[PDB]
Amino acid sequence: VSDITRFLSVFNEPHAGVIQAARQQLSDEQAPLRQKLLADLLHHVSQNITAETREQDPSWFEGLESRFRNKSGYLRYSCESRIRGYLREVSAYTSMVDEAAQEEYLRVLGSMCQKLKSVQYNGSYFDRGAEASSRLCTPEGWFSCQGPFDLESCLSKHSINPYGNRESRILFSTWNLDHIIEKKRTVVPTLAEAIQDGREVNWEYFYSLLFTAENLKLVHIACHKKTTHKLECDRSRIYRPQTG
Amino acid sequence: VSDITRFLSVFNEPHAGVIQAARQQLSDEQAPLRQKLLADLLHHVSQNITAETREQDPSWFEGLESRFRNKSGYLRYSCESRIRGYLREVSAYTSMVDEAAQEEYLRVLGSMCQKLKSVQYNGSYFDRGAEASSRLCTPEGWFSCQGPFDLESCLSKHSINPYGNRESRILFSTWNLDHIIEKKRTVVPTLAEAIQDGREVNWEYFYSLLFTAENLKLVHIACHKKTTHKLECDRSRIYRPQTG
Ligand SMILES: [Mg+2]
Ligand SMILES: [Mg+2]
Ligand SMILES: [Pb+2]
Ligand SMILES: [Pb+2]
Ligand SMILES: [Zn+2]
Ligand SMILES: [Zn+2]
Incomplete structure (x- = not known):
């Protein structure tokens, strides 16, 4: 179950085509939960502290x-x-x-x-x-x-x-x-x-x-x-x- | 960059040892951002709609x-x-x-x-x-x-x-x-x-x-x-x- 590390690994540091990716899956309507997580992730990444x-x-x-x-x-x-x-x-x-x-x-x-x-x-x-x-x-x-x-x-x-x-x-x-x-x-x-x-x-x-x-x-x-x-x-x- | 699909794939449906996993990485202190995403994920999953x-x-x-x-x-x-x-x-x-x-x-x-x-x-x-x-x-x-x-x-x-x-x-x-x-x-x-x-x-x-x-x-x-x-x-x- 150590999987996650690889996940938090890519979803943390922005400046990639990942932002322009998650947005696409959002436009492309999905289930309420998946849409949630996706909206949240975009939020988490679209940041400039x-x-x-x-x-x-x-x-x-x-x-x-x-x-x-x-x-x-x-x-x-x-x-x-x-x-x-x-x-x-x-x-x-x-x-x-x-x-x-x-x-x-x-x-x-x-x-x-x-x-x-x-x-x-x-x-x-x-x-x-x-x-x-x-x-x-x-x-x-x-x-x-x-x-x-x-x-x-x-x-x-x-x-x-x-x-x-x-x-x-x-x-x-x-x-x-x-x-x-x-x-x-x-x-x-x-x-x-x-x-x-x-x-x-x-x-x-x-x-x-x-x-x-x-x-x-x-x-x-x-x-x-x-x-x-x-x-x-x-x-x-x-x-x-x-x-x- | 199609990667994500595999990610939203495991992080959406609970009832696994994933919940008992993310919690561990939380206890095990981490960077502020990684801690955030992790806390959020646990939230997203620890649900019973x-x-x-x-x-x-x-x-x-x-x-x-x-x-x-x-x-x-x-x-x-x-x-x-x-x-x-x-x-x-x-x-x-x-x-x-x-x-x-x-x-x-x-x-x-x-x-x-x-x-x-x-x-x-x-x-x-x-x-x-x-x-x-x-x-x-x-x-x-x-x-x-x-x-x-x-x-x-x-x-x-x-x-x-x-x-x-x-x-x-x-x-x-x-x-x-x-x-x-x-x-x-x-x-x-x-x-x-x-x-x-x-x-x-x-x-x-x-x-x-x-x-x-x-x-x-x-x-x-x-x-x-x-x-x-x-x-x-x-x-x-x-x-x-x-x-x-
Ligand atoms: Mg008013
Ligand atoms: Mg008060
Ligand atoms: Pb005064
Ligand atoms: Pb009245
Ligand atoms: Zn709104
Ligand atoms: Zn609190």
Whole structure:
């Protein structure tokens, strides 16, 4: 059954008449399953990961505004958006906070924003060619599913390289940056409750929870459990230590 | 280059030691691309489309409530949800309607709901084993991307069988029932404006537009243009003909 090696051998490296071959078998209608595999294979091969600029691989950029000249640049922007989205969701909550603590909330929410700008909304997480302690991918653009929140790794071994294909760039939209300790369900509200407590809040902790890879797992959609994460915040890290 | 035929030949029909083979090459770490193709192949093969009950293929049902015993049944429910979702979105608009026409809107919105219940929210669209003039798939469960709204067919030839795999069932979540004439952008508001007109509204027309395959294209995420569909409603079908 060692057969396969010879198969993965030819179907991996493109630049051949294989691309112009698989396409023919596709045009020439076939069974649903065979058509699938064939469509997938063409996808797998019709790729150009190495290209970085719109000039050398404009296909990738189809549909993206013009400001986007570089791939890393777009993905960086994309990541910044999800995270900026989390910051918005956090402000929207100021209303469900006690009017008495509503001021401090905004004060705290302001600090988190400065720090976010200070780090450029962590857009660094999606762009290869960034410090290795910042990116979530290999310098080639390969991301690995980190498995569901309640597991150590991805049992299916999901991966994806949004950099070498237009469809690939779009599928990455389905990959989620999932909060281990749910942000809406638990972190934000705990944040509110902590600010009303009276003790000085260690907002940096909530920052970690809300916008950092410390509490974010990058998962493929099949590893995004939409069920409740039965986790809670760390009682001991919520408030700033009183220096006795 | 006719090679491939021999390849798609072995990689399509499972039930062999091939499954227990590809898995080994996966465990035995490899290059990112080879690992990809390999992970995908395992996916492609680890399938059981023919199974219909939770009893004969419980793997598929992982994560679904217990009430769901049958596959078609779940997918039917799933479809009904998207469509019921469109009905909600339509009610939520009653507030942005003139108070004077706000009553009729609810009257009309009521009629559409009766008809929807009368047809079971068209959940029929997703379940194989339904009248051939109702399903969007083959009796085996195969759906074909109908390409973007502004095109006749899917150039990439996207297909998917949510019935033979858990991950497959979840990916179908990314496949969208896209309104050709945008519902929020154009149909709903036209509906509101038409009800304020004074002439008798042919609400059945808007029904078609809002909940039927007459105005819904089933597209893979890569064929869901989120750009504006520069279309408008048919001026001549909005109002009921005055019998002269
Ligand atoms: Mg989540
Ligand atoms: Mg749409
Ligand atoms: Pb701000
Ligand atoms: Pb109703
Ligand atoms: Zn995974
Ligand atoms: Zn398509």
